[PDB]
Write a protein that binds this ligand. Structure first.
Ligand SMILES: NS(=O)(=O)c1ccc(SCCc2ccccc2)cc1
Ligand SMILES: [Zn+2]
Length: 257
C-alpha cells in the first residue's frame, strides 16, 4: 500500500518503515560548495561490455530493466568501492513536469528524471543478502535533463507500450546500458539507502555530475505508464520520486576539483 499518492506517499512511509527517519536515508540534496574533494577516491570503473539484459518489468512504481547477475558480466568497481558490484537492474524516477522528477538534487536544483543503475556486492552472494549489509549495494545515479534525444534510450522508450500497467513484463534482450552514460564519470559519493521501501541503509551512492539529455518526446513516453494494473482505474506513473532527506551526520565527497 505504500506509493506516491496523497494518502500513501513519502510522508506516510515511516508508519510501515520506521527506518524512513533513520540516520542515512536517501536521496539528499548535494550542496556543491560543501562536498569535499577527496583526492584519494579512484576513478570509477564501469565494465558493461559483457552485460546481458533479460526483461523489462512495470512493478507498479517504476519500470526495471533486469540483467543476468549470476556471473561477473556487468560490474562496477573502483571509486569509493571495495570489491566488485554486479549490475542487477536499472530504473528511473521522473516528474509530471520537466521541472521536477529527480530524487537527488544539486544545490536544490531538481532534474526532469534520475536513472539508477543498481549493483550488489558479490562478497554477499545474492541481492537479498546484500541489502542486509551496510556496504551491500552501489547505486550509480545519473540525472536526466530535457533537450536533445538520447539515442541509447530509445529502445527502452519504444517497449513501454507493452508494459503499460503494473505486473506487465516483456523480453528485453541485448540492451547495452553503456548507451545511457554521460561523457564524464566525475561523481559525488555518500553512504545512504534505498529510496523506496524497505528504505534499507545498504547503499553507497555514486551520483554523476554530468547529466544526460533526453528529448521531450522520450520523457513524455515515461509519463504514459500506469501505476495501476490492467482493468483498474488509470493513474499515470508520474512523480515517482522521494524528496531529499536530512543529511544528518554525513559528508558528501567529490571525485573532482
Ligand atoms: N531507488 S533505489 O535505487 O534506491 C532502489 C534500488 C533497488 C531497490 S530493490 C527493493 C528493495 C528490496 C527488494 C527485494 C528484496 C529486498 C529489498 C529499491 C530501490
Ligand atoms: Zn531508484
Amino acid at each position: 500500500h505504500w506509493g506516491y499518492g496523497k494518502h500513501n506517499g513519502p510522508e506516510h512511509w515511516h508508519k510501515d518503515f520506521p527506518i524512513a527517519k533513520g540516520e542515512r536515508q536517501s536521496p539528499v540534496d548535494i550542496d556543491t560548495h560543501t562536498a569535499k574533494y577527496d583526492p584519494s577516491l579512484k576513478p570509477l570503473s564501469v565494465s558493461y561490455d559483457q552485460a546481458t539484459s533479460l526483461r523489462i518489468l512495470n512493478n507498479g512504481h517504476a519500470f526495471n530493466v533486469e540483467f543476468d547477475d549470476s556471473q561477473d558480466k556487468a560490474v562496477l568497481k573502483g571509486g569509493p568501492l571495495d570489491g566488485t558490484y554486479r549490475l542487477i537492474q536499472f530504473h528511473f524516477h521522473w516528474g509530471s513536469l520537466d521541472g521536477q522528477g529527480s530524487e537527488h538534487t544539486v544545490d536544490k536544483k531538481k532534474y526532469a528524471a534520475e536513472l539508477h543503475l543498481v549493483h550488489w556486492n558479490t562478497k554477499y552472494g545474492d541481492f537479498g543478502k546484500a541489502v542486509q549489509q551496510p556496504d551491500g549495494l552501489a547505486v550509480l545515479g545519473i540525472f536526466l535533463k530535457v533537450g536533445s534525444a538520447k539515442p541509447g534510450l530509445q529502445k527502452v522508450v519504444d517497449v513501454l507500450d507493452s508494459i503499460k500497467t503494473k505486473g506487465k513484463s516483456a523480453d528485453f534482450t541485448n540492451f547495452d546500458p553503456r548507451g545511457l552514460l554521460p561523457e564524464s564519470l566525475d561523481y559525488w559519493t555518500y553512504p545512504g539507502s534505498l529510496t523506496t521501501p524497505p528504505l534499507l541503509e545498504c547503499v553507497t551512492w555514486i551520483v554523476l555530475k554530468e547529466p544526460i539529455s533526453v528529448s521531450s518526446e522520450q520523457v513524455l513516453k515515461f509519463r504514459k505508464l500506469n501505476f495501476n494494473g490492467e482493468g483498474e482505474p488509470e493513474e499515470l506513473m508520474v512523480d515517482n520520486w522521494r524528496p531529499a532527506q536530512p543529511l544528518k551526520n554525513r559528508q558528501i565527497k567529490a571525485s573532482f576539483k
